[PDB]
Ligand binder design. Structure first.
Ligand SMILES: CC(C)C[C@H](N)C(=O)NO
Ligand SMILES: [Ca+2]
Ligand SMILES: [Ca+2]
Ligand SMILES: [Ca+2]
Ligand SMILES: [Ca+2]
Ligand SMILES: [Zn+2]
Length: 316
C-alpha cells in the first residue's frame, strides 16, 4: 500500500506489549516500510487461501485477541531481518531486500507454521498442543531461515540434505532468540508448545534424546516418514552445533566450545559458500571445517572444536 509510515502498539500472543511499524492510508496497515522493501502481514481468516488480506486496523491499536498472532508474526519478522542484516550483512532472505510476507490465522486449529517457497504461514494451534505459532520467536526465525536456505544452498527437503535444512533453521532460530535476549535456550518452540505442560518443548538441541531424536549418526532414522526423517535426524546436526558453541563430552568425545557468535558465522558461511542442494552430513562437516579454516585458520581452536563435535555425533 501507498501511505504514511507510523508506529502502532499491540499485545502479543504471550500478553506482551509492543510497538510495530505500520502504514497509514485511511486504515492502519500491518506494512513496515523501514526494512528493506517491507514486511507485510496478512489475515488468512481461517481459510487455506493465501496470502489472504493485508491486515487493516482502524486506530493503530492491536490489543484484540484476534490481533495477537499478527502482532508477533509482524514484529518477530522485523527482528529476524535485523539479525540477518546486522550480524551477517544480508538484506532480507534473498540478499536483495525482498518483501517479507506472513499470513496468520490460517485454517482452523492448524498446528504448525511453514515457509511455502514464497511466504510464511501460521496456524493458531488447537489450543492444547500449540497456541498461535507466531508467538515463538525461534519458530518465526526458523521459518524465515527456510527462505534464506532456499535462496542460498537450496537443500532439497528430503533425507539428509533435508535434515541439514531443518537443523539450519533451528540453529538460526535459536541464534535469533539469543540475539533478541528473549529468554534464550537451546530448545525449539517451548513458548508456543503445550500450554498446559511446563518445561517441555518441540525439540531439544542440548539433548535431542529427551524427546527421542537421535543424538548420534548411528541412531540415524532410515525409513520413510517425515520425508526420510528431516525433523528427526536434524537432532544429530543440532547436537553438533550445540557442542561447538558450548563444549562438552558426548559419547566420551570432548569438545571445547568456541561460543555462539563464531558458531553463527562458520554456519552462515558453510550455508552460503559451500552447501549445495544435495549435500549430506559428511559434506556439511567438510563445509563447516572448510569455513572455520577460512575464517580462523587451519590450525585454529575453532577448526579443532568443529572436528571434535562432528566426531562426537559420529559424522565421519
Ligand atoms: C517445526 C514447526 C514449528 C514448523 C514445521 N515443523 C517446519 O519445519 N517448518 O519449517
Ligand atoms: Ca484496532
Ligand atoms: Ca526461550
Ligand atoms: Ca527456544
Ligand atoms: Ca509446554
Ligand atoms: Zn522447518
Amino acid at each position: 500500500i501507498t501511505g504514511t509510515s507510523t508506529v502502532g502498539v499491540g499485545r502479543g500472543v504471550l500478553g506482551d506489549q509492543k510497538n510495530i511499524n505500520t502504514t497509514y492510508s485511511t486504515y492502519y496497515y500491518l506494512q513496515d516500510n523501514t526494512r528493506g522493501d517491507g514486511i507485510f502481514t496478512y489475515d488468512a481468516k481461517y481459510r487455506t487461501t493465501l496470502p489472504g488480506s493485508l491486515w487493516a486496523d482502524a486506530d493503530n491499536q492491536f490489543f484484540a485477541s484476534y490481533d495477537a498472532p499478527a502482532v508477533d508474526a509482524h514484529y518477530y519478522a522485523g527482528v529476524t531481518y535485523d539479525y540477518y542484516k546486522n550480524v551477517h550483512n544480508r538484506l532480507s532472505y534473498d540478499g536483495n531486500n525482498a518483501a517479507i510476507r506472513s499470513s496468520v490465522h490460517y485454517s482452523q486449529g492448524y498446528n504448525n507454521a511453514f515457509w511455502n517457497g514464497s511466504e510464511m504461514v501460521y496456524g493458531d494451534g488447537d489450543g492444547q498442543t500449540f497456541i498461535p505459532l507466531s508467538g515463538g520467536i525461534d519458530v518465526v526465525a526458523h521459518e524465515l531461515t527456510h527462505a534464506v536456505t532456499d535462496y542460498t544452498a537450496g537443500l532439497i527437503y528430503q533425507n539428509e540434505s533435508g535434515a541439514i535444512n531443518e537443523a539450519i533453521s533451528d540453529i538460526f532460530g535459536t541464534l535469533v532468540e539469543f540475539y533478541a535476549n528473549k529468554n534464550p535456550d537451546w530448545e525449539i518452540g517451548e513458548d508456543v508448545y503445550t500450554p498446559g505442560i511446563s518445561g517441555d518443548s518441540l525439540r531439544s538441541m542440548s539433548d535431542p534424546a529427551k524427546y527421542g531424536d537421535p543424538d548420534h549418526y548411528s541412531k540415524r532414522y532410515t525409513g520413510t516418514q517425515d520425508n526420510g526423517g528431516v525433523h528427526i535426524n536434524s537432532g544429530i546436526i543440532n547436537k553438533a552445533a550445540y557442542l561447538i558453541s558450548q563444549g562438552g563430552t558426548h559419547y566420551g568425545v570432548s569438545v571445547v566450545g568456541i561460543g555462539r557468535d563464531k558458531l553463527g558465522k562458520i554456519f552462515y558461511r558453510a550455508l552460503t559458500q559451500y552447501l549445495t542442494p544435495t549435500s549430506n552430513f559428511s559434506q556439511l562437516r567438510a563445509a563447516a571445517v572448510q569455513s572455520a579454516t577460512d575464517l580462523y585458520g587451519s590450525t585454529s581452536q575453532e577448526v579443532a572444536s568443529v572436528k571434535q563435535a562432528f566426531d562426537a555425533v559420529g559424522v565421519k
